[PDB]
Design a protein around this motif. Structure first.
Motif, short mmCIF file in Angstrom:
data_model
loop_
_atom_site.label_atom_id
_atom_site.label_comp_id
_atom_site.label_asym_id
_atom_site.label_seq_id
_atom_site.Cartn_x
_atom_site.Cartn_y
_atom_site.Cartn_z
N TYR C 7 13.47 69.28 155.28
CA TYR C 7 14.33 68.47 154.44
C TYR C 7 13.83 68.44 153.00
O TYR C 7 13.59 67.36 152.44
CB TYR C 7 14.44 67.04 154.99
CG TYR C 7 15.62 66.28 154.42
CD1 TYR C 7 16.91 66.76 154.55
CD2 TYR C 7 15.43 65.10 153.71
CE1 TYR C 7 17.99 66.08 154.01
CE2 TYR C 7 16.51 64.42 153.17
CZ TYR C 7 17.78 64.92 153.32
OH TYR C 7 18.86 64.24 152.79
N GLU C 9 14.39 69.56 148.84
CA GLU C 9 15.53 69.56 147.92
C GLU C 9 16.16 70.95 147.80
O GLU C 9 17.38 71.06 147.63
CB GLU C 9 15.11 69.04 146.54
CG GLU C 9 16.15 69.28 145.40
CD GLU C 9 17.55 68.68 145.65
OE1 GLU C 9 17.68 67.71 146.44
OE2 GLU C 9 18.52 69.18 145.04
N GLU C 10 15.36 72.02 147.86
CA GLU C 10 15.95 73.35 147.78
C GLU C 10 16.81 73.64 149.01
O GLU C 10 17.82 74.34 148.92
CB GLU C 10 14.87 74.42 147.60
CG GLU C 10 14.42 75.13 148.88
CD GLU C 10 13.71 76.48 148.63
OE1 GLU C 10 13.63 76.92 147.46
OE2 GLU C 10 13.24 77.10 149.61
N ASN C 11 16.44 73.08 150.16
CA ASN C 11 17.27 73.26 151.35
C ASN C 11 18.53 72.43 151.26
O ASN C 11 19.60 72.85 151.72
CB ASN C 11 16.48 72.91 152.60
CG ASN C 11 15.47 73.98 152.96
OD1 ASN C 11 15.60 75.13 152.56
ND2 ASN C 11 14.45 73.60 153.71
N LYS C 12 18.44 71.24 150.66
CA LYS C 12 19.64 70.42 150.50
C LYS C 12 20.68 71.15 149.67
O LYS C 12 21.89 71.05 149.94
CB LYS C 12 19.29 69.08 149.86
CG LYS C 12 18.41 68.18 150.71
CD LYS C 12 17.87 67.02 149.87
CE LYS C 12 16.53 66.53 150.40
NZ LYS C 12 16.15 65.22 149.79
N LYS C 13 20.23 71.91 148.67
CA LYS C 13 21.16 72.67 147.84
C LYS C 13 21.84 73.77 148.64
O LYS C 13 23.07 73.93 148.58
CB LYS C 13 20.42 73.25 146.63
CG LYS C 13 19.90 72.22 145.65
N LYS C 14 21.07 74.56 149.41
CA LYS C 14 21.67 75.65 150.16
C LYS C 14 22.61 75.13 151.24
O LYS C 14 23.70 75.68 151.42
CB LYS C 14 20.58 76.55 150.77
CG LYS C 14 19.66 77.18 149.74
CD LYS C 14 19.37 78.64 150.05
CE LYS C 14 18.69 78.75 151.40
NZ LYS C 14 17.27 78.34 151.32
N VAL C 15 22.23 74.07 151.94
CA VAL C 15 23.10 73.46 152.94
C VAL C 15 24.40 72.96 152.31
O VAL C 15 25.49 73.19 152.83
CB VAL C 15 22.35 72.33 153.67
CG1 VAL C 15 23.32 71.38 154.32
CG2 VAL C 15 21.41 72.92 154.69
N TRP C 16 24.29 72.24 151.19
CA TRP C 16 25.47 71.82 150.45
C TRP C 16 26.40 73.00 150.14
O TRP C 16 27.61 72.93 150.36
CB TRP C 16 25.05 71.14 149.15
CG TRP C 16 26.13 70.45 148.42
CD1 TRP C 16 27.14 71.02 147.70
CD2 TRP C 16 26.29 69.03 148.28
NE1 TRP C 16 27.94 70.04 147.15
CE2 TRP C 16 27.43 68.81 147.49
CE3 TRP C 16 25.59 67.93 148.77
CZ2 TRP C 16 27.89 67.53 147.17
CZ3 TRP C 16 26.04 66.66 148.45
CH2 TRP C 16 27.18 66.47 147.66
N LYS C 17 25.82 74.09 149.61
CA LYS C 17 26.63 75.25 149.27
C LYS C 17 27.18 75.92 150.52
O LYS C 17 28.35 76.32 150.55
CB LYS C 17 25.80 76.25 148.46
CG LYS C 17 25.44 75.79 147.06
CD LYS C 17 24.50 76.79 146.39
CE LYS C 17 25.13 78.15 146.15
NZ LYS C 17 24.30 79.15 145.39
N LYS C 18 26.35 76.06 151.56
CA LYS C 18 26.84 76.66 152.79
C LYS C 18 27.91 75.79 153.43
O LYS C 18 28.83 76.30 154.08
CB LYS C 18 25.69 76.90 153.76
CG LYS C 18 24.92 78.15 153.43
CD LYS C 18 23.66 78.31 154.25
CE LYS C 18 23.01 79.65 153.92
NZ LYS C 18 21.54 79.69 154.06
N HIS C 19 27.81 74.47 153.25
CA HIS C 19 28.84 73.59 153.80
C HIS C 19 30.17 73.78 153.10
O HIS C 19 31.22 73.71 153.74
CB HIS C 19 28.41 72.14 153.72
CG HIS C 19 29.19 71.26 154.65
ND1 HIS C 19 29.23 71.48 156.01
CD2 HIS C 19 29.99 70.20 154.41
CE1 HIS C 19 29.99 70.57 156.58
NE2 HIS C 19 30.47 69.78 155.63
N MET C 20 30.16 74.03 151.79
CA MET C 20 31.42 74.29 151.10
C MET C 20 32.07 75.57 151.63
O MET C 20 33.31 75.64 151.73
CB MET C 20 31.21 74.38 149.59
CG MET C 20 30.51 73.16 149.00
SD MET C 20 30.23 73.29 147.21
CE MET C 20 31.72 74.14 146.69
N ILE C 21 31.27 76.58 151.99
CA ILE C 21 31.84 77.82 152.51
C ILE C 21 32.53 77.55 153.84
O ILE C 21 33.65 78.02 154.08
CB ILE C 21 30.76 78.91 152.64
CG1 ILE C 21 30.33 79.44 151.27
CG2 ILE C 21 31.30 80.04 153.49
CD1 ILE C 21 28.92 80.02 151.24
#
Ligand SMILES: [Ca+2]
Ligand code: NI
Lengths: 66, 13, 67, 14
Positions: C7, C9-21
């Motif tokens: 958990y 912050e760099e993972n929060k960014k990728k998850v956020w972006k992957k969630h938009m996809i």
């Protein structure tokens, strides 16, 4: 701290909702439809800035890395 | 990777 | 205190972006309805401890994040 | 809908 949308509570919610959706992607045929959609979308302008995330998703590279 | 997201959930304590 | 290994912050960014996809994927024809049918089952899956509010936000069409 | 909220958070990232 002045963020209205990209907030720590929202990050938390997205993380959990993303786990919910990942198990959906495992359901029969959802997997292949998702990869097919990623294929359809690979040339699409609206996804500039999302190249590494498209690649990780299509290649099977993990959603998060330690 | 779901396992890793789960571990990341374990860290929201 | 242990520094977070997953958990981050760099993972929060990728998850956020992957969630938009994946959100745009869920709008694809047929996917939404199969998703809601999946949420209808999972809501009874005893492996999801602490996700009840998220399961029902999703089932009832609430927004993913909150202003 | 909820995607545009996601997108606004994304533009809030950087
Ligand atoms: Ca293009
Ligand atoms: Ni039940």
């Amino acid at each position: 701290t002045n963020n209205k949308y990209y907030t720590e509570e929202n990050k938390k919610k997205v993380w959990k909702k993303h786990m919910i959706v990942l198990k959906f992607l495992e359901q029969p045929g959802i997997s292949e439809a998702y990869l097919n959609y990623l294929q359809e979308e690979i040339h699409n302008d609206e996804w500039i800035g999302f190249e590494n995330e498209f690649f990780e998703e299509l290649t099977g590279k993990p959603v998060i890395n330690v | 990777s779901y396992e890793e997201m789960a571990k990341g959930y374990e860290e929201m304590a």
